């Protein structure tokens, strides 16, 4: 009964029946096919016959055409045939998705989520097998620049060839075939798993969380597995192939990993989004358990019912998370700040900042386990990212364990937080904004920038030993780091290691933005900065001011006879609306700015 | 009874008696003398014998020594004698300021503010006359680089000479002497003025507001009156004189107005601060009138008692202010955005942004009245500043007229806002934060950045026709503007007109910061940016989150035996504290960044 299990604003908008959910899934497949058809045809460039495919997302999808062994010229007959067939598919899916199918519904009443998962195992088995067979007999782009059937081999431990990569797919087909049969007969009834059949939000949460972990493995694989046809190196090769437009080629020659790093940034960002949103759903499911006095006799066996009321567990556990953030942040940002002060003042002959030593630490544990040879850049960057992860987890674990009662609600005499969405409780006790579950969701989104930004600066080849460029007295440290980066870090395939800390790198990249794409990424930066600034007006403690001022603007529009425009100021966005929209736009406008950096 | 007339937090801190107020004034004079003594001796440079005076504020005070005809070498015998005598004065003033003087108090019970103003007229008369006489007989720096007595002349309409500038001071002495005598006998009892004797906050408000207007006249005079000894040109001359250290000289040769523009930025910023704080005091005085049912029988004659309750006056008046902001902002930012898009995309040969026309409008009204010959840079900059002023006035006029009742309090069924300092009323009606008088004070401080920033970018020679540098197709417009700027704009004495809009100018100035003062202004930028970011944690709708999380941090410190440090998290800053501190630091850290721009 989903309409009873969502926040108020969504009760009238959430698919409310088995059938409606299936229709939403169908229409979502229509969206997928439709995006493919749109982006092969539109948003390529101003003049594709001469400029090729220059614009983002289209470049990545044309890089796929290239990897498939098709003519990846802008608007080629292959590209158009692919785009038009996906449009056909989209229209058929949306068609079915917007008509009611009572027989389909009647059957869905008999389907369990365990059964659906069996079916998904064997659908995935089909896809994996058929794609292995397509590779095997019809081929993909081969080393000779021609479409080449891969053959089929199952020598898992021999060298990677097209044939064994085909075998890898067929093997996954077999594995999911046997696994689907096994679970068809045995079910998922084991304890600690039977409860999933009870609640769609629990299943949904787990899907999001595991998908987030898949995203992270994909980020790392896109850096490490750079084979030009069987890995993500097809994005390097496409950008300098015969199909690449002149400007894309010029950019890729000084930035070989250009398109790979755009894909990486997309998967980093989406992965963070599914991690935090998935945890929000699991926490919301738990909170509904805790608010349904009925929903307790089946879940009493789980420890979280107790932990969500135990103030000593809450403090010990959250304190451990905060320590896990504090220590690596202190080490990484403290070192990089000392080194920054040293780089800044290196020309000084006297005074407080003259003749500072550079802090230079390697990464012996990572090197011993994975075969890198890291420098202070990796040491600082990895501790800043690790710290950002634990930092982000502070609001995440509060969603999970603080959203019904906390030491604070007990301290101030409350029985329990009323629900998961209330924005505040007013000025009592010096102010109470954003103790609810959803407000900690937003805060985790905000904090997640401490993961995304250092990760991006690292991946794009910033010097992460310092916030500014390495000064001349410390050049030896940079040069040694550059040698072992080139010889031992797979990232050197995508990015040269510059001597520029992020602040200096911003100057250089932004300067380069004036002269690529006719300057457009400067327009992107400026517009994104404006919108980001405006979110302050929605996120600051100033909503009442705006609601009061909005009455003057509405009144003024009515006086002159344009009340249809004054309706824009019928009221200010509410606390809840302004926090949701402000967080969304604050977060995404930051990502737009980083996307500019990914375009040059 | 000031303790009854201030916000709660200040009742125990405000000087509570006539005598205590006088002592505070004495101690403030001690602060003035002490700053002079400190800054002539410390914070000059790391090694003054070789580097001279390099650091801000000290440079401006040494430029004064220079203008006085004294040896303005760092730590010269003249500088030390001046510094040590001002220290003596500070110690004597603070000495007297921290002892009780009962006879002085008994006499103060007999002093009125009208009497004090008579006395101030004749003290100012003394200062003006004695300084004219010092100039006349002992002199200031003369055109020959020597101290030269000016003589004394009263030829007001002849050419400006040192002698007539001395006469100007003596004449001001005479005028304030006659004016003090006149008011000694006639008083200030005229209607609409008698009420000032009633309330110290009304007098205080007016002093701040008029001082703000003086600040603005000083900003303009520092640009326009650039005479090298009798005007603010002494700051240009000092920076390239024999006393100037080598680096100050190197900077001034490419930036002649360096020190003048530092003084300008100081007076712009302080003037805005006194304007808004002065209006806050006047509004607070009015609000106390409206809250004292007694305080009405003497003020009923004033129209503001009515206006503060009249919802049609409130909407008409505030709507007029908003229009006065909307129209010039729309014109200035809309034009500059079109021109920005044109400059950005000027290299494009096709597509939506190719071959745009530059919007080019002059300033014929300003030219006809003041003798300028302005370009699109002046047209846009002046409308952006004018618009920023009306924008800032929106929260200012709400302080004055919305702080007891408003159309909003009537709409939601309230009798009246309880006081001037409450932070919010909670989530009712979609949220109620920052409708009080003090919260509109903060908002005016925030909004005032729309005055300060464009004014600074203009004064420092940014191209204000565009947010980026002028592109080659529009170079003719820049060159024509440069010719008439050089020949008709007095600002060219302080700043060359660059072809750089503020975004491009930021790149160039920040690049220059790496190589002046051993890079220190990069440290200033980075530290200021960090603090600015942190204010979000105090200004966002998130105070309850922090108070709840603070309990975990305090608990963790206590567990390990360092509860004296955990007291830092005894509680989060309250709504009221965090808004005051957040606004102060948001505002000042922005000013620090602009100060970096003023240093190069």
């Amino acid at each position: 009964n989903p309409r009873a299990q969502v926040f108020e604003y969504f009760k009238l908008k959430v698919p409310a029946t088995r059938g409606a959910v299936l229709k939403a899934h169908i229409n979502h497949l229509g969206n997928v096919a439709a995006m493919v058809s749109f982006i092969l045809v539109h948003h390529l460039s101003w003049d594709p016959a001469t400029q090729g495919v220059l614009w983002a997302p289209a470049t990545m999808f044309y890089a796929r055409l290239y990897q498939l062994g098709l003519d990846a010229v802008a608007l080629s007959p292959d590209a158009l045939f692919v785009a038009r067939m996906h449009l056909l598919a989209a229209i058929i899916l949306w068609g079915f998705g917007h008509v009611k199918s009572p027989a389909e519904e009647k059957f869905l009443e008999k389907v369990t989520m365990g059964k659906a998962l069996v079916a998904q195992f064997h659908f995935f088995a089909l896809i994996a097998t058929l794609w292995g067979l397509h590779m095997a007999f019809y081929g993909i782009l081969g080393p000779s620049g021609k479409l080449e059937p891969t053959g089929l081999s199952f020598d898992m431990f021999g060298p990677i060839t097209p044939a064994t990569m085909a075998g890898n797919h067929v093997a996954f087909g077999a594995v999911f075939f046997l696994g689907g049969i096994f679970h068809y007969f045995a079910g998922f009834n084991t304890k600690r798993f039977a409860f999933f059949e009870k609640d769609w939000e629990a299943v949904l949460s787990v899907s999001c969380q595991i998908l987030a972990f898949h995203f992270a493995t994909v980020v790392f694989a896109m850096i490490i597995w750079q084979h030009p046809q069987l890995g993500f190196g097809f994005m390097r090769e496409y950008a300098v192939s015969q199909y690449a437009g002149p400007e894309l080629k010029m950019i890729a020659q000084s930035n070989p990993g250009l398109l790979v790093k755009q894909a990486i940034l997309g998967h980093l960002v989406m992965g963070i989004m599914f991690w935090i949103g998935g945890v929000f759903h699991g926490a919301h499911f738990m909170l509904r358990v805790l608010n349904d006095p009925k929903l307790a006799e089946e879940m009493k066996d789980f420890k979280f019912i107790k932990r969500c009321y135990d103030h000593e567990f809450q403090k010990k556990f959250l304190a451990l998370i905060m320590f896990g953030a504090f220590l690596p942040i202190f080490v990484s940002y403290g070192i990089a700040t000392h080194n920054t002060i040293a780089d800044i003042h290196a020309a000084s002959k006297t005074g407080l900042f003259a003749h500072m030593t550079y802090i230079n630490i390697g990464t012996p544990l990572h090197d011993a386990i994975f075969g890198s040879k890291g420098s202070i850049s990796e040491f600082v960057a990895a501790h800043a990212i690790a710290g950002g992860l634990h930092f982000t987890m502070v609001p995440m674990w509060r969603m999970v364990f603080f959203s019904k009662v906390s030491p604070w609600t007990t301290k101030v005499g409350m029985k329990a937080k009323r629900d998961g969405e209330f924005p505040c409780l007013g000025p009592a006790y010096g102010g109470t904004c954003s103790i609810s579950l959803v407000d900690q969701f937003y805060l985790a989104i905000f904090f997640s920038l401490q993961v995304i930004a250092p990760a991006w600066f690292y991946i794009d080849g910033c010097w992460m030993g310092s916030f500014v460029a390495v000064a001349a007295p410390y050049n030896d440290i940079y040069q040694a780091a550059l040698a072992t980066f080139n010889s031992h870090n797979p990232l050197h395939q995508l990015s040269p290691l510059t001597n520029m800390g992020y602040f200096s790198y911003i100057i250089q990249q932004t300067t380069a933005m004036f002269s690529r794409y006719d300057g457009h990424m400067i327009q992107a930066l400026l517009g994104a900065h404006f919108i980001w600034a405006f979110t302050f007006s929605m996120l600051f403690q100033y909503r009442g001011s705006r609601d009061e001022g909005a009455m003057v603007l509405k009144w003024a529009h009515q006086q002159v006879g344009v009340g249809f425009a004054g309706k824009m100021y019928n009221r200010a966005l509410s606390l809840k609306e302004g926090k949701a929209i402000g967080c969304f736009l604050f977060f995404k406008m930051t990502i737009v700015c980083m996307w500019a950096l990914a375009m040059v | 009874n000031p303790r009854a007339q201030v916000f709660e937090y200040f009742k125990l801190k405000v000087p509570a008696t006539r005598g205590a107020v006088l002592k505070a004034h004495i101690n403030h004079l001690g602060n003035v003398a002490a700053m002079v003594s400190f800054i002539l001796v410390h914070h000059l440079s790391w090694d003054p014998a070789t580097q001279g005076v390099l650091w801000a504020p000290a440079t401006m005070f040494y430029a004064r020594l220079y203008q006085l005809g004294l040896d303005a070498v760092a730590l010269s015998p003249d500088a030390l004698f001046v510094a040590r005598m001002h220290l003596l004065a500070a110690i004597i003033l603070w000495g007297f300021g921290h002892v009780k003087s009962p006879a002085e108090e008994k006499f103060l019970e007999k002093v009125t503010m009208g009497k004090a103003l008579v006395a101030q007229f004749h003290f100012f008369a003394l200062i003006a006359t004695l300084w004219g006489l010092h100039m006349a007989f002992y002199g200031i720096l003369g055109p020959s680089g020597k101290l030269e007595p000016t003589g004394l002349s009263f030829d007001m309409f002849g050419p400006i000479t040192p002698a007539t500038m001395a006469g100007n001071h003596v004449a001001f002495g005479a005028v304030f002497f006659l004016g003090g005598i006149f008011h000694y006998f006639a008083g200030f009892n005229t209607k609409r003025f008698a009420f000032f004797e009633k309330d110290w906050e009304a007098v205080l408000s007016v002093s701040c507001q008029i001082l703000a207007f003086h600040f603005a006249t000083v900003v303009f005079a520092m640009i326009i009156w650039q005479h090298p000894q009798l005007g603010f040109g002494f700051m240009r001359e000092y920076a390239v004189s024999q006393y100037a250290g080598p680096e100050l000289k190197m900077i001034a040769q490419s930036n002649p107005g360096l020190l003048v523009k530092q003084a300008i930025l100081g007076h712009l910023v302080m003037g805005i601060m006194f304007w808004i704080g002065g209006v806050f005091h006047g509004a607070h005085f009015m609000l106390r009138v409206l809250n004292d049912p007694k305080l009405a029988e003497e003020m009923k004659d004033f129209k503001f008692i009515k206006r503060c309750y009249d919802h049609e006056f409130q909407k008409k008046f505030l709507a007029l202010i908003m229009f006065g902001a909307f129209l010039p902002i729309f014109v200035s930012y809309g034009i500059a955005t079109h021109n920005t898009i044109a400059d950005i995309h000027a290299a494009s040969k096709t597509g939506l942004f190719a071959h745009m026309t530059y919007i080019n409008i002059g300033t014929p009204l300003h030219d006809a009245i003041f003798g300028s010959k302005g370009s699109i840079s002046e047209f846009v900059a002046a409308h952006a500043i004018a618009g920023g002023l009306h924008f800032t006035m929106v929260p200012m006029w709400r302080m004055v007229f919305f702080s007891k009742v408003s159309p909003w309090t009537t709409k939601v069924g309230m009798k009246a806002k309880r006081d001037g300092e409450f932070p919010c009323l909670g989530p009712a009606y979609g949220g109620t934060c920052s409708i009080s008088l003090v919260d509109q004070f903060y908002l005016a401080i925030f909004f005032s950045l729309q005055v300060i920033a464009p004014a600074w970018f203009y004064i420092d020679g940014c191209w204000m026709g565009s947010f980026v540098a002028v592109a080659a197709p529009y170079n003719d417009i820049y060159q024509a503007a440069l010719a008439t700027f050089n020949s008709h704009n007095p600002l060219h004495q302080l700043s060359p007109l660059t072809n750089m809009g503020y975004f491009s100018y930021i790149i160039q100035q920040t690049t220059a910061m790496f190589s002046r003062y051993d890079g220190h202004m990069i440290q200033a930028l980075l530290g200021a940016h960090f603090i600015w970011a942190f204010t979000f944690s105090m200004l966002f709708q998130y105070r309850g989150s922090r108070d709840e999380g603070a309990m975990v941090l305090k608990w963790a410190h206590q567990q390990v035996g360092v509860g004296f440090a955990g007291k830092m998290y005894n509680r989060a800053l309250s709504l009221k504290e965090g808004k005051a501190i957040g606004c102060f630091l948001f505002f000042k850290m922005t000013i620090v960044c602009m100060w970096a721009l003023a240093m190069v």
Partner: peptide, 25 residues
């Protein structure tokens, strides 16, 4: 990509985005 084409399409983006706040307010 003439001036009239380009102004027209800019105004199209403007009118379109302007309706986003109406959905909430």
């Amino acid at each position: 990509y003439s001036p009239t084409f380009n102004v027209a399409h800019i105004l199209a983006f403007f009118f379109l985005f302007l309706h986003i706040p109406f959905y909430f307010v």
